[model samples]
Target: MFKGSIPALITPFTDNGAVDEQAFAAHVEWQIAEGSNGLVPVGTTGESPTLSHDEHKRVVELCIEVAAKRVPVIAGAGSNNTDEAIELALHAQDAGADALLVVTPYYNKPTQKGLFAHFSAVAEAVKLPIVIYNIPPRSVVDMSPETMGALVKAHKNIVGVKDATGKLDRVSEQRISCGKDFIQLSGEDSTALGFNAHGGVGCISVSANVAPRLCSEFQAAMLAGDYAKALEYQDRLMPLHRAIFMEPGVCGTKYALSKTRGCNRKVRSPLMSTLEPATEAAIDAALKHAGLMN
Candidate 1:
C-alpha cells in the first residue's frame, strides 16, 4: 500500500541544536500539503545518528500526530544493533506508524548470516509491515539475492525493499526473487523513472524534501505508465536532484531547505554544521532552476 514518492524527512532544529518539535511538525504539515506520499522520521536523511533515543521517538511521534493518518508513516527504526532496531521498531508500532523501515546494519558490516538474523529478529518483534533498506553505499554491507529470497519466505511480515544498490537490474532480479507482491521502492532520486520502469513502484527520496509536489507529480505519472509526461517531470526534477546531492551530505539538503523554507540548518558533528561556499551556490541555483528558491 505504500507506493509513491516517500520523502526521507530532514530533521529540523532550534538554533541551539535542540529538536524543534514545533518546527518538525510544521515541516511535516508543509510536506503533506505539497503531496509528499509518506514521511520517514529519523531516517538517515533525518540525522538519526545524532538523535538521542528520546529525541528519535519524539520526532516520530510528532510526525504521526501531524500526519494524522493522512498518509502512511514508514518509521525509520533501523540500527546497526539488532536490539536497537527493535527498540525503536516497537515504539513505532506503539505510536502507530503505518510501516517500519529497518536498514541493514552499518559500521559492523554484518555477513549474510548476520543480516538474515538481524531482520529476522525485527520481524519477530514487530507486527507492522517491514521494508528492508539495502543500502550498501552507506551500510557497507550488501544482501545477495539468495539471502533476500530466503528472508522473504522466512518471515511473513518482511514485505519489501528500499533498494539503493545503484544497480537497476537488481530490481528486476528482486522482482523475480521476492515476487510481485513484495513492495519495491527505489532509493535513487535521479534515476527513479528508470527504477520504476525496472519494476519499482515508488521512490524513497532525499530531494523530495523541498520539491514535494514535483516529486509526487512525477511519481504519479510514472507509476501510471505515462512515460511521455513522467519524463518531463523527471527532466525538470533532475536539476534539484543534482543540486541537493552536489555536496554529498545532509548539510546540503538542510541548506537548500533553509533557503526555500525558513528552517535552521544545523547538523551533528563529524558532518559539517555549515556548508562550503561553492556548495551553497550550487544548491541555491538548483532550487531556482527548479523554481523553488525562496
Candidate 2:
C-alpha cells in the first residue's frame, strides 16, 4: 500500500520553538507536489522524542489533512511502553492514518519474545498495517528475522519492516523468513539503490525531506527496472544523504529547509538548533550538487 521516497518527515518548529503548523503544512504540500510517494510523520527524524503527545498526534492529523489521500501517511506510533504505543496507534487510526511505523522498544531492552508480544498487542489494538522499524543503532534492541517472521505469522496486520540494520543481507534474510510478499523498505538512504536490487521496495529517507523530486525520481527509476538512470540519481543524491545525517539528522534536514525553502531551522532542546560549520558547508555543497540550491 506504501511505496517510494517516503520521507521520514521533520517537524517544523517556529523561531521560538513551537510546532510550526503553517510551515509544516506547506512542507507537506511541497513534498507531494515534488512527487514523494508517501509520508511518515513524527518518526525519529520528526523529533518525536521532543514532541508532546498532543503535538505528535496533531502533526499526524495535519499531514493526513494536507495529503488528502493523495499519498499514504504512516504515523509514527512507537514507544518503549506498550500501552503508550497502543494509545498513539489508536489515535492515528481515529485520525485516518494509513498505517503505523512502530520502532523497536529502546532504553529498556526487550528479548525477542517480548518484542513479539509488544508488536502483537499493537496489532490486536488496531487494524492499521504495522511497519516494524528495526534500527539497532538507535533502539539498541534488534528483532531477528526469526522474530519478525513469527510476528508476521501471528499478526496479519504486522506487515513489514523499515530495516536500518544497514546490512544488505538482512533484506535477503528477511525475505527468507517473512516471505516474498512482505514489504521491505530501507531506512538507510545511501544504500537504497542496492536495497532495491535485493528486494527492497523503496526508502524511508531523510534526504527526501530536502529533495523530494530527486528521491522520488530515483525510486521510480529503480521500480521501473531502470537501474542505469537511477544510478545517475544516486551519484547526485549520495552527498545529500551523507551530509543530512552528518549530525543529528533532523537538525541537518531543518537547516537545509531553512536555507532553501525558508522553513525554520529551530529544533527542540537537547538537540542543538545549530549545525557545525563543516556540516553547513557540506549541506550547502550538497544542495548545489543535487540542483536543490543555486
Candidate 3:
C-alpha cells in the first residue's frame, strides 16, 4: 500500500563523515511536515552503497521512529548478495518498516530466473511487503515484466515495483502483467509526471529531499486528477529535477539542503562532497525557479 511522493531520502552525514542521526531525524520531521506521502531511507539517494550495514539499519530505525506511523517507511534492503539482502530485509521488518524496497542484484547480471529466485527467497524470509526496484541503469539487470508477473503470482508478499527503466510504457505493461492492483511507483524524478499519467501511483523521488512540499503537492495534483495543476508543478520543478542530477543525486540534494535548510552537505569518499560552482549555481537558479530560494 505504498504510494505518492515518497522521497528516496539522503542520509545526512556529519562533517567528519559519520551518520548525522540528529540531522536525519530532523530532515524526516520536516518532510512529513511538508506533506510527503511516505519515506524511503537508505535507498540510492540515501547512498546505500557507501553505508555500513549498521548505519543502514540505524537509518531505517530512526526514520520509523520519527515517522511514528504518520507515514510509511519503505526501507531499502537491497544487495547483489541474496543473503545480505535478506539480512537487511529481515532487520527492516523487525524494526517495524512498512515495506521493503529491494533493488535488482547489481554487477552479477543475474538472469530472469536468477532474479525470480533472489526475490522469492527474500519474500519467503519476511512477511513485509516487497517493492521490486528495477533500475537497469545502476543494477545493470532488468527484470522483465514476465518475471515480475511471475513473482506476483508466486509470492503474495511480492507486492509492487519501483520502475527506473525510464520507459513509461513499462507501467502499462506492468499493469497488464502484474495486475492493476499492483502498486507502481516511478524511481526516476524527471519522468515521474508521465509515469503517473501512464498508471504509476507515485514516485520514490530524490528531489523531494530538497523540495518536499513542491514534490508532494505535485503528486497530489496528479493523484487528484488535476492534470492542469500537476502540469504547472511539473513545469516549476523540471529544472530542479535536471539540476540535482548534474552530479551524484545525493551530493546535489545535500548541497541544496545545506543552502535551504542548513543541513550539512558532507558526503563520503568516491562521491565528492562539494559541488562545482557551475552545478551549485544551477541548483540555486532551480531553487529560485521552484520558489524555494530567494
**lDDT for residue 25 in candidate 2, whole number 0-100:** 93
TM-score per prediction, in order, is 0.97, 0.99, 0.99
The regions of model 1 sitting more than 4 angstroms off are none
How well does candidate 3 match the true structure in TM-score terms? 0.99
lDDT of 2 by residue, 5-93 (tens): 99999998888989999988999999999999999999999999999999999999999999999999999999999999999999999
Write down the lDDT of every candidate, Cα atoms only: 0.89, 0.94, 0.94
- For model 3, how does the per-residue alpha-carbon lDDT over 120-182 read when each residue is reduced to its tens digit? 999999999999999999989899999999999999999899999999999999999999999
Where does the lowest 10-residue lDDT sum fall in candidate 2?
256-265
Off by over 4 Å in 3: none
Q: Give the lDDT of residue 84 in candidate 2.
A: 100
What CA root-mean-square deviation does each model show from the true structure?
1.1, 0.7, 0.7
Model 2 ranges with Cα > 4 A deviation:
none
TM-score of 1: 0.97
